[PDB]
Write a protein that binds this ligand. Structure first.
Ligand SMILES: [Cl-]
Ligand SMILES: [Pt+2]
Ligand SMILES: [Pt+2]
Length: 129
């Protein structure tokens, strides 16, 4: 499922990401834009042999079990396949443990390089929330 900008914002807001640990909704949407281009089915192989999964490109080295990442953790206690659902509940729930880790949204390189310090609330601009 490829979300719409304001569709995704609404869904994330409905799941409690707006201002979660201080990160306004715009950050979470901008993160999704530059991670998966809003596509729940996005997958991408990392250099280390891990894979990034879903709307926020959650990664198999620490966060989920994909059955093929040697010496990884499943800190969110889910199959990585669960992050490719058209229902974003597990992507959001796992992002909430990721973002609490102490690194914040810096865990996402896309957010750090493309969203951090930008007018991120442009990404929610015009949406009925
Ligand atoms: Cl839900
Ligand atoms: Pt929820
Ligand atoms: Pt939902």
């Amino acid at each position: 499922k490829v979300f719409g900008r304001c569709e995704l914002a609404a869904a994330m807001k409905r799941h409690g990401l707006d201002n979660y640990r201080g990160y306004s909704l715009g950050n979470w949407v901008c993160a999704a834009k530059f991670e998966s281009n809003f596509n729940t089915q996005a997958t991408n192989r990392n250099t280390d042999g891990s894979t990034d999964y879903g709307i926020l490109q959650i990664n198999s080295r620490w966060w989920c079990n994909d059955g093929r990442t040697p010496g990884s953790r499943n800190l969110c206690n889910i199959p990585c396949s669960a992050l490719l659902s058209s229902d974003i509940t597990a992507s959001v729930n796992c992002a909430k443990k990721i973002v609490s880790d102490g690194n914040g949204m810096n865990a996402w390189v896309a957010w750090r390089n493309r969203c951090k310090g930008t007018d991120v609330q442009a990404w929610i601009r015009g949406c009925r929330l």
